[model samples]
Target chain A: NIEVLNLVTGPDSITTIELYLNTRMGQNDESKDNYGYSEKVTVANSSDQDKPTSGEIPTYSTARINLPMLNEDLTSNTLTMWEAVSVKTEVVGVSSLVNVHMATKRMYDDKGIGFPVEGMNFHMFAVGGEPLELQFLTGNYRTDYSANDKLVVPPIKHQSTQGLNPHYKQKLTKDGAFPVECWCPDPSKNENTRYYGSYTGGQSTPPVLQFTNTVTTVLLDENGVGPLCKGDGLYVSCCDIVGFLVGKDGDMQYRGLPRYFNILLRKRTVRN
Target chain B: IEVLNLVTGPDSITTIELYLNTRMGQNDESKDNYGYSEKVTVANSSDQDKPTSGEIPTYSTARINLPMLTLTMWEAVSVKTEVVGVSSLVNVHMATKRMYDDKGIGFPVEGMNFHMFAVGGEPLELQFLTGNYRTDYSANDKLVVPPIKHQSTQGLNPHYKQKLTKDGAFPVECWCPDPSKNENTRYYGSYTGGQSTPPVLQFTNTVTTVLLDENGVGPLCKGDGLYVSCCDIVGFLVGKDGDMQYRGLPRYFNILLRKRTVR
Candidate 1:
């Protein structure tokens, strides 16, 4: 109510203390740019090994944001202390019938289109919940190559399946775990005749429309501040990997995308 | 080395996240993100940021290395900026409500007309505001009556000459904002337009700017380094001369530090 009447009458202080959690990021939607409620995922660079005929088997999306709300919870609760003074990200919305390419879709096999807009890969804090490591690096399918390839290595076996090449040609178990439904840690088959169509020889790029109006940075350690959240919670991991290819024909299906995060939390009261 | 307060702490407040992209400031390395003058349309719209064909023009200066506060001292007090993902440029695939090449058709409107953004404590000094200027302004030669008004409002005339420089290099269209040369900058700006105006932009990251002044004081940094110098000459024309349609983005440095004691 007017900010709990301004915390019952503002300045609940000892030199002023607590307030500022305007955190709004999603996939657990209500919609602003909703994210993944209305469906669509994986552009975290494209191709999580492959087998999503239509989409979402392990298609790629690591968004577990949910950190903020306490005391204001009214009845039954304690735990407070949330001070992560800044987390602003952007790319509000994009979808040109879809073409962020790469399933060995290698710029749609030669510049038919890929990246009308790009730049997505940010991994932040995992404070005490849900982030059971969704992609790290030792090799980079973001899962240590399905456990260093079951022991030593052997996961690049796709040479067939039409020249359609979307790779992730199946079969990967034993413990090396590559099919949370299937896709491979794949991407190397579109057979680069050196990208022809609209032409892209930098390997691909051009969404520098001024980088969406420029702004995204993080540097405040050595005690400048950020990431000291708790109350048994405070989690965040991102993926703005754009997606969409709905239809022009029959099986063009590929959907997954969402954006907006203004995370700027800071609140602490227990007198220090 | 600490003792703080913003509400209460061991450090109070500090935020620095930037990405201005010239393909990640000329192909990789991060202070959040960096980018600058690598040909944003030269040959006409006034032509003066030449890398020409071979393309080498990074000119980066995002500088953020603050921390050498022994025995205490640090107070940058207030800042709350947000230009994050500038609405991902509202994709129409390649927005063209119809303007063809001089560009300025759709998506990206009323925002970025020429802003040399500044944030400082130790290094943020540059005062060279000139015009009628033509270091060779190009936009693929679209006629040549472009007029010359890379407007940041272009005022602050320290009599007649001074031209200081810590090197943000210069030529953000042509230049402005030498309020007698950034006295340890922390400059927040606003223009609203010209060249027909297309720069009054916003969306997402809940729109913010709070850089306080009028005595609450908000730009104080005295050492170790934290200078953020920006060159924002964004485009979309909504009106133009080679037609107009361009781009660039990077602005996030919520540096609100404090610990103060030493000098």
Candidate 2:
């Protein structure tokens, strides 16, 4: 009986796919479009603040850098859809350190004292998809730079409302492009908006963070049996912001952290 | 050469999904405590983090009931588990100006580090030490605190005691897997203490755990239940006295098991 079951269920069950994407990896895929770019993911850069090429990541804003998942060779589209079981990420790639300049500095007495430099101390990282419409947010407010991109929770403790940002509701209606992952005021319990995660380091100075070693945390998909990639697109979202800096200058610019992922997958034969 | 049992489908493998929230030690089974047990835990001494009744905002432990098997039993295979709400930290939490401390910003990655996560087919036994334990503790509750030592096994991580609190009760300062007790479990943890210490944690949406041991066998479900527990102490930083405990999120577990013809 056991041998018959083994014969019926092929032994070639699981497949592991390794992927590496930085700021400029898959920009050539002109057909690939998410958050308004043909690029795999556009980082929040400050090389040109006036024109703002890379875009901005606001606190209340629902902007995310979505990386298009391709096969091992990096060019072929992963045609055969499978169920994602587990994923492990290593900071093989790196990002800038949070320092005085990178931080959105807040003040203690308006002008009297400035809080300690809070570099890009907070990190909102999660995996998303154009297909996981009911699982996570597929779209939201910004696709490029504008007034809405400046920042979300303006430094003033008095005004942390989404109304502070211009197109709060209109964008949400676009395609349910709302943020499913966050820090507080628990996400809406809407059946579509399941939760995700983040990482934070208050004192990430120059020498502290550079993705030097491996971040051995494994992310298991919700429902235990990972998301089935029916194939619109697969992405990794980096929703970053300046830690504790309300009313400060500068945006969550230069926000993208190039990552390396070991996505463990199982070839789908039957749907359970 | 295809080897032994191939996880064909439902008849061979059953995935058990269980969710445990931060509500621990509620004195009454009606409530839960994530990690903190009520302050009136001990009849005399005070608790370290001292969370009064209905304040379980940290780590927790719970043993879940599983389908009973008869002939063979339930054998574990693989798992997928996660801490909920890792991405929800982007919302505005600062309702007060004074809260703009290290913790008031976002998830405090740097702080007092304490942790250990254990998932098993049975209760990961404890070799306890006396503390402000919840007088009435239940192994079946959201969080478990064995008020007194069940056995005299050597305690590994001493700092875990620094984080003692409750669910329907409080936490035991130190509860590590006793080599003699964890006959059917797997646990892992790391601690690097200090507020100023540099901390790094990464979040993911796809990760899994393989539950097999050297003999190519997994934990055999004992007495019809599977146990899961975690003290995911995110860490503590300056003015972040409660962040580590307060930031406790609900966890999701999916235990994939194969019924070796049980019943």
Candidate 3:
């Protein structure tokens, strides 16, 4: 769930919207900690398949969230895979969940393709101490009312880089708004190319500096730290990723391969 | 396939025809004919938008001719439902009260077995009424269908060799249920049927490789007789002349695997 607050009004709606996992929102200090810590781990030293590490930075944090499968059908003798399952937050949350679903899928001006389409971006707004709340409404089952009961998006394991300050050595003001951002790689730049962050393990250094997509939740206060807003309204954003390798073999090789949901929670106002 | 074990019956035998049909019910009793049937309106609680929507109750009954055989109790062995659209969802809930003698004091049947299958676009879901167990189909659900290694030119289409046991023996009389049972049965054989004589008791004409265990070993039964196992088998019918290939639903059969000791 991505939450944003808008303290300022109108043209300046660009006031920073800081994002945090539900569990990390209310914490009081900057003593960032996580399950395990490692940076610059290569295939030679990679012991765990899931635990990837970045070069050790005091503020670098990796977090996970478990999103449970919804329990909508009470009479089902056996629950569907999506029922009563937990959700996770990781790089998977952004690329697999947000990007794949919410990104743009249109022909470019010259008939090319790009994502994060015109006006359609992944960001939230918020007011100080007042975050947003996301909700579940309605959805089609895996069958399209047709074949099998498996979900297009199975309850997944989401992975992401947490607490990586874009401005790592910047000053913090108690009463000032600070921007803490997370980055997403461009879809056009995948494992096939030599660009930085191309997902190709072969690259050590790349040609051009890459721009990353991220959820940066700005925290405002006397010391630059605070909690989200209480009691906010809700809405949902959905998108479908087709043409991706999402068959039986693909599903077994990569969990939650093609389908996704980019759930956004914003402060409800008259205009929205 | 249909396989029936028949023995000498009573002096007189009776036969009865029963049919079951289900549709949306206006009220519970409108569709049910069982003894002491009742229907109460139950709301569809899961959907918040459809608070006013409720379910109609119903029951059904049938008569089986068995003069000497007293059916003191009856229960549903299995319930199967199929849907065509990707529309609103619905589930089946069977009433769990037992039917007893009119006097209330009589011999009672002990346990009942009930299973339900919901089939449509989604993978098939099977519900076990007792354990509250439910599951959809997956690759793991596919059973190893028995295969025929070779065929012989003797019986109707001639005789062929089959992979029945660890050691390949002769006169390995094997039998499968009649083809009318399930449509999903797939038989892969070289026998293209168009013969004048029907093989009374012959093997499937489909060509199949011998089934082996994880270690690639054929089923090794020390002695020979009959071993029963559940599997997905190729579908075909042995007619008076030859066999006809069938293309229908996958069939799960409890088949007999015969073993012969070099004799």
Candidate 4:
């Protein structure tokens, strides 16, 4: 039994949605601090004959828009490698919310969660204050993830560890523009051993809170600088903040999960 | 190809293409069908033309099929239409099956499959679907085919052997081993029922072995199952009835090593 919620509700309305994932690549060059830092690996290295590299670039796929809608026909279950579904990302805005939906089920072995929200506002970080809301991108689930029905708020780990083996993740959306669905955070599975707990080897750097003179609120999320302390790891396996829609008066709206959306990307290889 | 004319407004004219009968005459009234001369009014919506205009417009004519019609050439037939500017009569380009492109080159029948007769008094069954030629088989006899290896670079009828694999429907993985040897390289050639577009077989290297005197002189030819046991990488295609015309003799059995294990 899978659950899906529409981030946008109107007829053909544009909706903004953001998605994130955390990764721990099995192997990494602590020297490089690039976005998707990785080392060239071959088939011989991994315990799994397929993917030997723990810290590797995650696979990404997006369906084309012109493809036939899945809901229109009941016989079509979900997209599989055989059918080769094609669809594009639906644009979402305050007014346009009709087409954006996410599938809330177990897809393949790759466990994933997607949701939608209403208006999302921002709160900038002030000096000497806590950091902004940071999202974690994780994949190839480990022992820490629990299949709980209730919303499991996964804890962020690591205080601060400067350079080399310093834990890292991404803040999915820098601004109010919610993406339809994109692979925000995908890390190698072998980045650290304490990945299941809150002790991710990153230093939990303090956030700088700030208030604006204008009526418009700002988010405290910022790039660079470690968000966690040294000798810390990510405790939560996966999380969905899609339903937490922020409003004009700093009113946070809990919209929960979205309806009928799917994450699909082109595989590097096809059997044919 | 025939050109059609379209007229606009008042009284437009339209034309229909009519093929002739076997009697060398254009029959206007054949069986229950109407002929050219009878004056009839074909009521059409003149206003169907999106916007009404004094200037006549041109439109593509609709195609009508008459399964029972066969056409002949040089026969004169007249057609005229009465929609004001419409000429009911149309011209048709006649086609003939008996084409005389006989420059010693066999030209294949467009929509037909051909049959090949082997030298051993037996006919081989093969049909080519999508190529400029009747088959993927090369006219060059020296081009090395796999499995049958004993090719003669300087022999009488330049001989070469090649192996072909099919996934039930189509051919895949076409290759020739090595032709790096210069003087040992053999040149080759072919004949087809129709003028066939030549095929290009790119090999990693070229073999300078002269493989065939005529077409079927190489290892494992058209009418024969090769005696592959003795000839490892090369063997001759033996003519079924031992006829020299459609087949070749397993002349110089030199393919020594790899042939024993192959089926």
Candidate 5:
């Protein structure tokens, strides 16, 4: 039998996280118009239903939970810009965890194609007793590109030499953890880039968006470093300030361009 | 007569050694007894000089050489020479003035010779030596120096001094901006005769340590005795702890005078 860990607890704890993505936001075809933007989430097992109470289980110190991609079409394919991003989180034992997702739309390419392709740029947000950390490893995403030209841009690979790009050495970890790069359309290419051109302008190509496989981890209270999570709850929020983009659509007037994601974590008991 | 442009406007003053005579116009058998001199040039550069046109003009070819054996009275006590150059007017300035003769005894020297000037930007400074001396010297220590001046400043080619005073320890005072007025200032480290290898003196923004000898090194003022000399520039900043923390820069001029006996 396969044992799945609870969303907010380690195997040694009893606290769990149950969440529901309100992508529908009250209407079926609503994501098509909003580009999958969701503002509300239905939380399960919450003490107040609206607010989740923390410190529920004993013996379990922390738990890690991987969130599902929220931007992707959950049932059918009706949107073409921005896809779901993979994010993870670790919560303090028996603590309630909450999250919110946000992203901006742009067109970009991953295969280095001169013509842009359809994609989505998204950022993950997770908050609990103490905020968790996230990362993107090498080979997880591309870093080079042109705003509008057909030039094959050089890849910005990591350098391991002592003096060469020493600042980035920590980003290339043995676990392959690197800071995730944001995929935002270059605003500098306002005149020639497809996404930045006037709404009705012809001879323009919609910019392809950039995306990444983000890895999130929990902050544990190891060693005697004092309590870093002193606040009521750990609130961790990060976004690629560079911007996330999605393509194949030229409608800048689209309201609600984010998709709602809801996830539920039930305690998995081990049976002998 | 030989002319020497001792200090340039913007460029750094290279290695300088000052020597002084504590005896009279006639002959004194033990030259080492009353006559003293040593090199005062720091090991490295703090930063580069600015471009040629700016207020911080730099001079390269200038040089000055003072013979240890020379005239007496006035020259023996102190020598005051004005700097020369087109940029000298706006760029050049006077350094610390020291009157070691009053302190009593061996070859009286006030300040180091090598001098340089800068136009703008916060000139790097040595704030304060945080850590204690590698070794300690009692109040009954002695220090000596050659002919020189000790002064401190903050303006154009500003000259400044460092003042170090603790409970019943060696005290060395400098000219200008009274050392007592500025709590942010301190002096360099000194050591006594000990191990084969002398204790190293490191001046970092964080930790600075000096070796101690029988009468701790430099121009130290024993107990109630007052010795006034110019102190070099030491930087000061208000740390996060809401208190002014003193720190020293890596680059600066320092003149360590030789000692004779315990005061």
Candidate 6:
């Protein structure tokens, strides 16, 4: 039996979040419209078959998701690079009544157990006040393949040493449990190049966005804080300043299974 | 000269006392710009002839020399002050404000010299007041040396006498020698040793520690003794929580000579 870990919508809360899976870098899309926005997921009510709950889940639903990156040469596809994922949330009901936890990780990354990814950028904003704490991180995702065919994730060894680079990054394992790789550029080798841009929230509330353009720029999205990242793509996670509306506190967002999101390359199958 | 309280720290006081006798505010770099000279020319004394402009008189040459000393004094017995919001300024301070460069360039403060004096005298002997002054320039802007006509009388040995007072506070009583001319208090700092703390002073070495944090951190009396903190910008106010302690550019106080005499 093969155990598959995937991200699933809550166990339901009143708060809502729309997830987008954009293959194209967030910077390339213009129109100010969400290029690959999530559809409102409306939950169905059991009492009225035709009517949907006033508290609706955005339409987009995915049990299992995979990410595949196109190389600069376009010769082949790989999943060894960083993919900037953007997520935004909306508080539909009463004020302070809901909290949202926005999180992301490798499809199979488990708690303190998984190959490390470069890092993650998580941002948030409120109706009032300068966009709150902007988070930007850089980390590595790695794993050592066992000779017996079982893959084991290791413990967190060290903090990211990307220095101050949006593009400069290196992926390493604390305990040397897996192959180490990174997008982090060398500071001594590339001192003059601009790696990231500054974050931008200036002050709009909804639809916050964050992105890193050049090697020097880590641009915060509208109402967002970022170029934030961490080591293991599978191990990295982020929580919203506001939480979901379920459980003891009534929070809508749930981490669910699959601590990290996995990137997969869909290939053409040859029939024999 | 009658002396009151003495202090030494960071550097030995024995050698620093010698440097304290030097001029106030003037520095080696400053000397280069305003070359010191007793006269512009030389003449044969017996002939009674004025020397020509071409002739020169002997004077000290301009040279960049470390301020063997710099200091600040106050009239308070402790670093704390009766003035509201001034306990931060308590302590011996020494610094040299950068003057224009020798070549007339902007020599943004290359460095500074400092020493802080904690008030060691009784508070009753100290006197403080807001100081102000006005001056008029001559047609050529040359300063006319006005005669200081007050009789030079010996002042009471208040350093030791005032300490005997039961009350820690002392009230101001002396008449202003002349409000119009008393522009600058030769020097000022909270000094337990005088009518006013002498500002012109010296420090033999670098200010290794700056007092910071721990402000009003403890219960301190108006005239009680206090200690200099060991944080950034010590002996000066810079910050409270996690921000820059003081704002803007750093400015040093002027130096002054202090003396005492019998009442």
For this target, which candidate reaches the highest lDDT against the unseen true structure? Answer: 2
lDDT of 4 by residue, B130-197 (tens): 10111122322222222332211111111322222211111111221111111111211111111111
- After superposing candidate 4, which stretches have Cα over 4 Å from the reference? A1-85, A91-156, A161-184, A187-250, A254-272, B1-263
Question: DockQ of candidates 1 onward, in order?
Answer: 0.04, 0.02, 0.00, 0.00, 0.00, 0.00
DockQ leader: 1
Candidate 6 chain A: worst-modelled 10 consecutive residues by lDDT: A93-102
CA deviation > 4 Å runs, candidate 6: A1-272, B1-263
lDDT of 5 by residue, A118-234 (tens): 122222333332323222133322333232122222245443311223223221111101222222222232111111111111222221111111112322213211111211222
> Model 6 compared with the native: what TM-score?
0.13
Where model 2 places Cα greater than 4 Å from the true spot, the runs are A1-272, B1-10, B23-59, B68-70, B91-93, B96-110, B129-170, B196-199, B235-245, B261-263
lDDT of 1 at B204: 53
lDDT (tens digit, per residue) of candidate 2 on A1-272: 00001111356556655553332111112123211111212343443332223222222222222223423333443333354555554322111111111113322222211122233333434443222222222122222234333222212222223223221212122111233221222233222222354555544332223221112344433534444443423444333332322224422222322334555555543312
CAPRI-style docking class of model 5 based on DockQ: incorrect
lDDT values for all models: 0.33, 0.38, 0.18, 0.18, 0.19, 0.18
Please report, as a residue range, the 10-residue window in candidate 5 chain A with the lowest summed lDDT.
A92-101
TM-score of each: 0.30, 0.37, 0.15, 0.15, 0.15, 0.13
The whole-model C-alpha lDDT of candidate 6 against the native structure comes to: 0.18
For residues A116-208, what per-residue lDDT tens digits would candidate 4 score against the true structure? 122221111111011122334333222122221121223443323122222444332222221112123223432211111111111111111
For model 2, residues B52-112, the per-residue Cα lDDT tens digits are 3442323366766767542556677777877666554344343322245535554333332
Second chain only: TM-score per model? 0.32, 0.62, 0.18, 0.13, 0.17, 0.17
- Model 3 chain B weakest lDDT span, ten residues long: B127-136
Chain B TM for prediction 5: 0.17
TM-scores of chain A across the candidates, in order, are: 0.25, 0.42, 0.17, 0.20, 0.22, 0.17
Alpha-carbon shift of residue B263 in model 4 (angstroms): 53
What are the per-residue Cα lDDT tens digits for candidate 3 across B164-261?
22111111012211111111111111111111112121223242333322222222222221121111111122122221111111112222122212
